Amino acid sequence: ATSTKKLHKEPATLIKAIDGDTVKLMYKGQPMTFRLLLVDTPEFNEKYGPEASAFTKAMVENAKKIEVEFDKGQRTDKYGRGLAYWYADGAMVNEALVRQGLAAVAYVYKGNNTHEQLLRAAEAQAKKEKLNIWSE
Ligand SMILES: Cc1cn([C@H]2C[C@H](OP(=O)(O)O)[C@@H](COP(=O)(O)O)O2)c(=O)[nH]c1=O
Ligand SMILES: [Ca+2]
């Protein structure tokens, strides 16, 4: 089975920050746009959008080391974007954004949701504290 298999972190280098949930990284020596697994962030024209983008930008740009961790299902979406959990010096970007109430758990599929419970826990706490998107 694959449900109990482990995930592995891989090195990547920041090329440029994009927005709340996408980033341009050099992976295996090639440029790629990565999308955060299991989340949905407000866009630039939406409330908390500029905040989410700023949060992710700072987290990735100030990271000494960036790593990507693909899940066990789809590694690239229909738009050619890499689907992964990103880590900035050991801290998961997907989790951090949700914990601050700057993103919501979304796009949770099959065997591509290894960190679902972890993220839902962060969302519950962000909602309890009425942080950002949960203050409405
Ligand atoms: C996060 C994620 C997004 N996507 C696709 C679905 C959405 O396209 P459709 O709307 O055409 O189906 C789009 C959402 O991305 P954004 O939220 O960046 O716009 O990315 C996946 O296919 N798998 C994923 O795991
Ligand atoms: Ca989004």
- Which residues make Cβ contacts (< 8 Å) with residue 72, sequence separation at least 6? 2, 5, 7, 111, 112, 114
CB 100 within 8 A of CB 48: no
Q: What is the CATH number of the domain that holds 19?
A: 2.40.50.90
- Ligand showing the shortest atom-to-Cα distance for residue 83: 1
Domain range for 74 is 1-136
CB 76 within 8 A of CB 8: no
29 — phi, psi (to 5°)? Answer: 80, 10
- CB burial of residue 44 (10 Å; 0-12, 13-18, 19+): exposed
The CA-based angle 12-15-89, given to 5 degrees, is 45
Method: X-ray
115 lines ligand 1 (CB under 6 A): no
From ligand 1's centre to the CA of 67, what distance in Å? 21
- Is 120 an active-site residue? no
What's the total number of domains in the chain? 1
Residues 114, 46: Cα–Cα separation, whole Å? 29
Atom of ligand 1 nearest to the CA of 112: 25
Read off the DSSP letter of residue 9: -
Q: Which residue's C-alpha comes closest to atom 19 of ligand 1?
A: 40
Atom of ligand 1 nearest to the CA of 39: 1
Find, among 111, 73, 108, 115, the residue nearest to 92 by Cα. 115
Strand partners, 82: 34, 76
